[PDB]
Design a protein around this motif. Structure first.
Motif, PDB file in Angstrom:
ATOM      1  N   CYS B 415       0.818  -1.211   0.000  1.00 54.79           N
ATOM      2  CA  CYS B 415       0.000   0.000   0.000  1.00 54.79           C
ATOM      3  C   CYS B 415       0.853   1.262   0.000  1.00 54.79           C
ATOM      4  O   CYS B 415       0.657   2.157  -0.832  1.00 54.79           O
ATOM      5  CB  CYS B 415      -0.940  -0.009   1.206  1.00 54.79           C
ATOM      6  N   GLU B 416       1.814   1.346   0.925  1.00 55.09           N
ATOM      7  CA  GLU B 416       2.656   2.533   1.019  1.00 55.09           C
ATOM      8  C   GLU B 416       3.320   2.844  -0.317  1.00 55.09           C
ATOM      9  O   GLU B 416       3.305   3.991  -0.779  1.00 55.09           O
ATOM     10  CB  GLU B 416       3.703   2.351   2.123  1.00 55.09           C
ATOM     11  N   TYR B 417       3.873   1.819  -0.974  1.00 53.67           N
ATOM     12  CA  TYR B 417       4.526   2.044  -2.260  1.00 53.67           C
ATOM     13  C   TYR B 417       3.540   2.587  -3.285  1.00 53.67           C
ATOM     14  O   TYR B 417       3.887   3.458  -4.093  1.00 53.67           O
ATOM     15  CB  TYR B 417       5.171   0.750  -2.756  1.00 53.67           C
ATOM     16  N   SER B 418       2.295   2.106  -3.249  1.00 53.17           N
ATOM     17  CA  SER B 418       1.273   2.655  -4.133  1.00 53.17           C
ATOM     18  C   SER B 418       1.038   4.130  -3.839  1.00 53.17           C
ATOM     19  O   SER B 418       0.903   4.941  -4.765  1.00 53.17           O
ATOM     20  CB  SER B 418      -0.024   1.862  -3.994  1.00 53.17           C
ATOM     21  N   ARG B 419       1.013   4.500  -2.553  1.00 54.31           N
ATOM     22  CA  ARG B 419       0.896   5.906  -2.183  1.00 54.31           C
ATOM     23  C   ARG B 419       2.018   6.745  -2.773  1.00 54.31           C
ATOM     24  O   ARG B 419       1.852   7.958  -2.937  1.00 54.31           O
ATOM     25  CB  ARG B 419       0.884   6.057  -0.661  1.00 54.31           C
ATOM     26  N   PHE B 420       3.151   6.127  -3.101  1.00 50.44           N
ATOM     27  CA  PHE B 420       4.265   6.848  -3.692  1.00 50.44           C
ATOM     28  C   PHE B 420       4.239   6.836  -5.214  1.00 50.44           C
ATOM     29  O   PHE B 420       4.921   7.657  -5.837  1.00 50.44           O
ATOM     30  CB  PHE B 420       5.588   6.256  -3.194  1.00 50.44           C
ATOM     31  N   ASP B 421       3.461   5.939  -5.829  1.00 48.53           N
ATOM     32  CA  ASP B 421       3.495   5.772  -7.273  1.00 48.53           C
ATOM     33  C   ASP B 421       2.214   6.182  -7.979  1.00 48.53           C
ATOM     34  O   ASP B 421       2.232   6.341  -9.204  1.00 48.53           O
ATOM     35  CB  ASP B 421       3.804   4.312  -7.633  1.00 48.53           C
ATOM     36  N   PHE B 422       1.113   6.363  -7.253  1.00 48.83           N
ATOM     37  CA  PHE B 422      -0.169   6.658  -7.874  1.00 48.83           C
ATOM     38  C   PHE B 422      -0.880   7.753  -7.095  1.00 48.83           C
ATOM     39  O   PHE B 422      -0.785   7.829  -5.867  1.00 48.83           O
ATOM     40  CB  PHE B 422      -1.051   5.406  -7.956  1.00 48.83           C
ATOM     41  N   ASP B 423      -1.604   8.602  -7.831  1.00 50.86           N
ATOM     42  CA  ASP B 423      -2.314   9.714  -7.206  1.00 50.86           C
ATOM     43  C   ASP B 423      -3.483   9.227  -6.357  1.00 50.86           C
ATOM     44  O   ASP B 423      -3.715   9.739  -5.257  1.00 50.86           O
ATOM     45  CB  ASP B 423      -2.811  10.686  -8.276  1.00 50.86           C
ATOM     46  N   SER B 424      -4.228   8.242  -6.850  1.00 59.65           N
ATOM     47  CA  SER B 424      -5.446   7.799  -6.194  1.00 59.65           C
ATOM     48  C   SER B 424      -5.588   6.294  -6.374  1.00 59.65           C
ATOM     49  O   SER B 424      -4.784   5.648  -7.051  1.00 59.65           O
ATOM     50  CB  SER B 424      -6.662   8.537  -6.757  1.00 59.65           C
ATOM     51  N   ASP B 425      -6.633   5.737  -5.755  1.00 61.51           N
ATOM     52  CA  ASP B 425      -6.929   4.320  -5.916  1.00 61.51           C
ATOM     53  C   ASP B 425      -7.351   3.975  -7.336  1.00 61.51           C
ATOM     54  O   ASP B 425      -7.226   2.816  -7.743  1.00 61.51           O
ATOM     55  CB  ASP B 425      -8.029   3.896  -4.942  1.00 61.51           C
TER      56      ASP B 425
END
Ligand SMILES: Nc1nc2c(ncn2[C@@H]2O[C@H](COP(=O)(O)OP(=O)(O)OP(=O)(O)O)[C@@H](O)[C@H]2O)c(=O)[nH]1
Ligand SMILES: [Mg+2]
Lengths: 170, 1069
Positions: B415-425
């Protein structure tokens, strides 16, 4: 107004960046194109869940004859926005130039690449042709000063990068 | 005087660099500065005064910029002594005129290096041969000057090689000189990096002298950042020079925090360079002992524990390095050049897998492409190292199929890495979908290289899923892992039964699993859908143990009539509807792929579907007719024309009774009876029951006929084909001719079907569309889901358990009309190959099709015309034998091609004149144009085909065809003009060159190609191909027709004097 950030707005001439900041500040669309003489600095205050954040945007002249102290405007910049036109492919051709002059002075600052004028029908720069942002690890946004499409997404991404909070929102 | 001007310049630059300054003051100061730069005679002394260390960094930058400006614009107005004074001035500014490395701002270093670069670009080789020796003797002084020299070399290489901000004469001069001195330059850069990394590492851990280390380190970084400016284009001779010392030091620096990012960047740009394969061969040194040692060491630090931005950006860069390196190995090994499987090929895999097991979705998704290129390599897929790393890859892929790592949630460490790579869900959702569709194929390849362990993992995942864990489930971890396990199992089984032999398949384990899934029971729709997909995947095992046939049926047919704990209180949900539909689909696949195994149970199945359809309100029409499709799919195993014919006539007797009734005829042929019988007549406006049952019965008939035409067939084996009475005869080429058992039954319904299609097309007329009430006046529209489906815009998944039913009754009507349209034209499309001879030899069938299928095309929308061409016309013509081309294909294709051409012309006219309500229609025009051009291309050229020649030998079809092809070049579609000019136009003209050509349609033709040149113009492809086409047209048609030379005279800025020479040589033998 808790903190200020220096944001440099660069791009080729006629890409629509003065119209972009003018639309953010006043909500007015200027159909006529009057080139910037040097730089025009404008304040942009955003209200976030972490409080108010101020952006001093230095709106740069895109043409060489009307550029002032071009790279001299980048001094002490904390974030950058390189803007090109999806109607003129030459703007996307010149994006790497602006990026090189930006990074040479401001090493390791958040930079957003924006494709302006997405509202126009004839789009000369296909979305799949845009790979430079991935090449230099930059964020890209399709924007339109007239349509307000993805209006605050470059400013929001820059703010999240500077403050260091992925959950920052306007 | 210089000093007064210098104070004034300080005031001006101070004002311009103040954001709170007024605009009038800014324009005054800027105008004064530009005028100063343009016509002042003491610019150089003033700029040198401002650039002195005593001044503010803003002022010094301004003065250095003044020097760069006089070199950039006023260099040709300067004397030789002035140029020498400026050159020595800035050179001594490098020598002793700046601050230390750690104390100087980067904009001052950039501003200073720009001047030297500009002088180099003015006159490097001829007038300044000792320049490199001056940068060398400057670099030897200290690390400050060394960093400055790095700046200069980097900006020079960028300016002359990449950006080419020079006159091509000086550009070629400087590039040639660089190519000549490349050994010395790369020697300077490599030696500098080596010695400075030594000075840094020797003091890397020392509290007495940190500023020394940070000095050397900051130079070592700079060198790297300048090396990255040369590696991409410099000859490979220098990259591998001194035994690839640059690549080995580059790999060693991957383990140095302060230098890892730059070294990884240089490795990426070095491993991504293209060209000759023999020139990419030396890149295999990165698989050496030291190189793979350091690379593996750097990759092993991808523990996935926590997110540090520096470390993660480094990990993405190194990941790209390993990906491109793998692509390079797959490219070099495939050519069969003298390249062998690297000695350390395992280590690379162990490194690559480190990014495959990483929590970051972006890293694994990036790894997937090189994994796919690896698993299909003809030499590497047989390598024991890959075959030993494949189970761990399969495990990681199982961890990839599960939809985890939302930026909002905190379930998985991803999840954290997604918070760094994508603006939103949402962006993460689209990325995950694309990466999953990609993951399917590479996963399949892995299952091909090792089916047994793959089957073990799939089965064990299935057992674990069976024994573990709004009262139902909605995209919870349970449903997500159920979907992942379902995908993995389905792929693993489907591939295992494709690669393993009938003797190698572990039957007992498979039937054990199937039993376990059958005994498992759930009242939750989604989980039950996963279950039905699991038994549908495990079904090939029942071939060995047919005794499980009943239980399987009990699992499927039950789910056909599945409902929630409440049945008539709440509206039907999309989830339960998907369980019933999914069950019916599993029955169709079951009876289609294994009909010899289901044939003994045909009695019980027939009676079961009979009882199921005893209640007209129990099952939906798609469910009813799906079960009927299964029934006829079993009936195909009789392999007897008469018996199958009797079963089909008996089964269709109710549908034929309802369809062939006088009332149904009156409702299908008349427009008023149709609009009244369907429900569009009146606005209790909320009740759709008055005519909804009617629409359900009509849809039942149409669905049934479609399923019969679609699923009925004769035996595949020829002996079984003629042994059952299917072979009527043989073609003059020896190809057999068959008759279909359903032919006589479908042909009797064909007329009423055509009448319904005629009425349906007639409905779109504006005086016929005005009949419907205002809530229904948009029933013939495109569904919003179809609009957003074609428009590309995805919408978040409406959770299928609640708010599921389409509450808009208008949406129900739109689904009805769309389904009716596509289904009718589906029947007309399938009819050809199913009943070839008897369908193509109906009396006046072409006149009937023109009377019904194409009756109101002028008012038929684009989103309805395109499925008619793709679904009906293309299979009708592509399956019709040549014996009926004159009888059927030509008379239909003439007016069809004429109308299509004209319509596309007017619509593109509407396009050229130039919120989403109009943005969608344009995309409809584009895709419809692609479908039409693909229909003509597949219909005519292979060059030409017997159908292409036959249509060409007819007058109308030839004209409409050529006009469409040539005026299509004027559309704003490049990908289509490239294919059209090369594959379509010239075979046409070449086919109609010998004979009469119109006196001025030649002018329209050449002028149309000229329109193609005016529209596209810059695209190298259609520019070259269009120029070639027009060149062939002019060289082939000018000696016969003089009218073209005037069309050349109207071209802007053309010279008549050379035109006359071109025609003069044209006339000569
Ligand atoms: N259709 C459309 N036109 C736009 C859009 N944004 C800007 N323009 C037009 O493009 C022109 C560009 O004007 P400017 O913004 O002043 O030019 P610039 O990109 O800032 O470049 P400079 O000359 O350096 O100021 C304006 O006259 C606008 O009318 C847009 O989003 N959509
Ligand atoms: Mg501007």
């Amino acid at each position: 107004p808790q903190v200020q950030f220096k944001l440099v707005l660069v791009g080729d001439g006629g890409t629509g960046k003065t119209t972009f900041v003018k639309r953010h500040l006043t909500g007015e669309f200027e159909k006529k194109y009057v080139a910037t003489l040097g730089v025009e600095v404008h304040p942009l205050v955003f209200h976030t869940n972490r409080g108010p954040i101020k952006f001093n945007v230095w709106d740069t002249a895109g043409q060489e004859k009307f550029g002032g102290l071009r790279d001299g405007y980048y001094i002490q910049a904390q974030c950058a926005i390189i803007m090109f036109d999806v109607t003129s492919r030459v703007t996307y051709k010149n994006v790497p130039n602006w990026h090189r002059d930006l990074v040479r002075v401001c090493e390791n600052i958040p930079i957003v690449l924006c494709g302006n004028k997405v509202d126009i029908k004839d789009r000369k720069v296909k979305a799949k042709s845009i790979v430079f942002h991935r090449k230099k690890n930059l964020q890209y946004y399709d924007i339109s000063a007239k349509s307000n499409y993805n209006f605050e997404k470059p400013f929001l991404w820059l703010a999240r990068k500077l403050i260091g909070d992925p959950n920052l929102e306007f | 005087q210089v000093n007064a001007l210098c104070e004034q310049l300080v005031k001006a630059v101070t004002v311009m660099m103040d954001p709170n300054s007024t605009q009038r003051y800014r324009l005054e100061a800027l105008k004064f500065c530009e005028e100063f730069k343009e016509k002042c005679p003491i610019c150089v002394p003033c700029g040198l005064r401002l650039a002195e260390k005593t001044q503010v960094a803003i002022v010094r930058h301004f003065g250095l910029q003044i020097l760069e400006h006089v070199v950039k614009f006023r260099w040709n107005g300067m004397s030789r002594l002035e140029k020498v004074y400026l050159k020595n001035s800035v050179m001594e500014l490098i020598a002793n005129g700046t601050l230390n490395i750690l104390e100087e701002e980067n904009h001052i270093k950039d501003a200073l290096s720009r001047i030297v670069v500009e002088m180099i670009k003015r006159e490097w080789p001829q007038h300044w041969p000792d320049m490199l020796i001056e940068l060398d003797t400057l670099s030897k002084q200290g690390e400050t000057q060394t960093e400055l020299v790095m700046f200069i070399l980097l900006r020079l290489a960028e300016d002359v090689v990449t950006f080419q901000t020079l006159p091509p004469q000086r550009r070629r001069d400087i590039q040639q000189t660089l190519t000549q001195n490349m050994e010395r330059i790369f020697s300077f850069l490599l030696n500098t990096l080596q010695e400075n990394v030594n000075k840094y590492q020797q003091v890397k851990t020392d509290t007495s002298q940190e500023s020394k280390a940070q000095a050397n380190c900051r130079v070592g970084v700079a060198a790297l950042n300048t090396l990255a400016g040369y590696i991409d284009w410099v000859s490979m001779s220098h990259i591998t020079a001194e035994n690839c010392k640059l690549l080995e030091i580059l790999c060693l620096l991957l383990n140095e925090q302060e230098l890892q990012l730059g070294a990884a960047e240089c490795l990426l740009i070095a491993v991504s360079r293209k060209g000759k394969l023999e020139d990419r061969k030396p890149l295999m040194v990165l698989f050496g002992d030291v190189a793979m040692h350091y690379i593996l060491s750097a990759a092993q630090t991808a523990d996935g524990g926590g997110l540090v931005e520096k470390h993660y950006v480094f990990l993405k860069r190194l990941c790209q390095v390993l990906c491109a390196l793998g692509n390079q190995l797959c490219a070099l090994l495939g050519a069969d050049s003298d390249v062998e499987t690297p000695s350390n090929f395992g280590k690379y895999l162990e490194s690559f897998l480190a990014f495959t097991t990483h929590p970051s979705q972006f890293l694994r998704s990036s790894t997937q492409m090189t994994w796919g290129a690896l698993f299909r390599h003809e030499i590497l897929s047989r390598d024991p190292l890959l075959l030993a790393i494949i189970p761990k890859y399969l495990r990681a892929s199982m961890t990839n199929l599960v939809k985890m790592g939302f930026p909002s949630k905190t379930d998985s460490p991803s999840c954290e890495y997604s918070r760094f790579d994508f603006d939103s869900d949402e962006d993460f959702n689209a990325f995950f979908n694309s990466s999953r569709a990609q993951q399917g194929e590479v996963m399949r390849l892995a299952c091909r290289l090792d089916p047994k362990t793959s089957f073990q993992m799939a089965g064990e995942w299935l057992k674990y899923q069976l024994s573990t864990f709004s009262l139902c489930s909605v995209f919870s971890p349970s449903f997500v892992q159920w979907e992942a396990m379902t995908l993995f199992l389905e792929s693993v089984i489907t591939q295992m039964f494709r690669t393993l032999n009938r003797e190698e398949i572990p039957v007992n384990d498979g039937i054990e699993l199937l039993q376990m899934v059958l005994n498992f029971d759930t009242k939750d729709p989604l989980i039950l859908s996963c279950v039905l997909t699991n038994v549908s995947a495990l079904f090939p095992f029942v071939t060995y143990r047919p005794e499980f046939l009943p239980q399987v049926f009990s699992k499927l047919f039950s789910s056909v009539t599945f409902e929630t704990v409440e049945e008539s209180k709440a509206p039907r949900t999309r989830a339960v509807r998907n369980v019933r539909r999914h069950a019916c689909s599993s029955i169709i696949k079951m009876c289609r792929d294994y009909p010899q195994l289901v044939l003994p149970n045909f009695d019980m199945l027939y009676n079961h579907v009979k009882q199921l359809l005893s209640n007209e309100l129990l099952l939906t029409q798609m469910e009813k007719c799906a079960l009927m499709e299964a029934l006829v799919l079993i009936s195909n195993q009789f392999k007897n024309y008469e018996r199958q014919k009797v079963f089909l006539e008996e089964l269709m007797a109710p549908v034929a009774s309802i369809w062939l009734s006088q009332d149904m005829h009156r409702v299908l042929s008349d427009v008023d009876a149709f609009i009244a019988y369907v429900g569009t007549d009146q606005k209790d406006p909320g009740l759709e029951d008055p005519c909804g049952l009617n629409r359900a019965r009509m849809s039942f008939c149409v669905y049934s006929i479609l399923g019969v035409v679609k699923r009925t067939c004769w035996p595949t084996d020829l002996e079984e084909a003629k042994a059952g009475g299917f072979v009527v005869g043989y073609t003059s080429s020896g190809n057999p001719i068959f008759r279909n058992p359903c032919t006589e039954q479908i042909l009797k319904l064909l007329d009423n079907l055509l009448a319904l299609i005629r009425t349906h097309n007639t409905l779109y007329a504006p005086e016929m569309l005005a009949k419907m009430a205002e809530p229904f006046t948009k029933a013939l529209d495109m569904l919003d889901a179809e609009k957003s489906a074609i428009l590309g815009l995805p919408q978040p998944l409406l959770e299928l358990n609640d708010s599921p039913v389409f509450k808009t009754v208008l949406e129900r009507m739109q689904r009805f009309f769309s389904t009716l349209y596509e289904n009718c034209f589906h029947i007309l499309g399938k009819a050809g190959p199913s009943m070839q001879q008897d369908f193509y030899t109906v009396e006046d069938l072409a006149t009937q099709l023109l009377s019904s299928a194409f009756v109101n095309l002028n008012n038929i929308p684009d989103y309805r015309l395109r499925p008619m061409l793709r679904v009906f016309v293309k299979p009708l013509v592509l399956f019709c034998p040549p014996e009926h081309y004159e009888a059927l294909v030509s008379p239909i294709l003439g007016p069809l091609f004429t109308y299509l051409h004209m319509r596309l012309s007017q619509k593109w006219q509407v396009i050229n004149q130039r919120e989403s309500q109009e943005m969608l229609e344009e995309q409809l025009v584009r895709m419809l144009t692609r479908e039409v051009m693909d229909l003509i291309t597949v219909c005519c050229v292979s060059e030409l085909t017997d159908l292409g020649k036959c249509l060409m030998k007819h007058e109308d079809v030839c004209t409409a065809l050529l006009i469409t092809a040539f005026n299509s070049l004027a559309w704003k579609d490049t990908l289509s003009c490239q294919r059209t000019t090369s594959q379509l136009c010239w075979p046409l003209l070449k086919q109609v060159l010998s004979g009469t050509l119109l006196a001025d349609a030649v002018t329209w033709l050449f002028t149309s190609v000229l329109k193609g040149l005016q529209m596209h113009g810059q695209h190298d492809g259609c520019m070259a191909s269009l120029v070639h086409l027009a060149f062939q047209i002019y060289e082939a048609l000018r000696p016969r027709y003089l009218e073209i030379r005037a069309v050349m005279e109207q071209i802007p800025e053309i010279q008549k004097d050379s035109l006359d020479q071109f025609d003069c040589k044209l006339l000569n033998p």
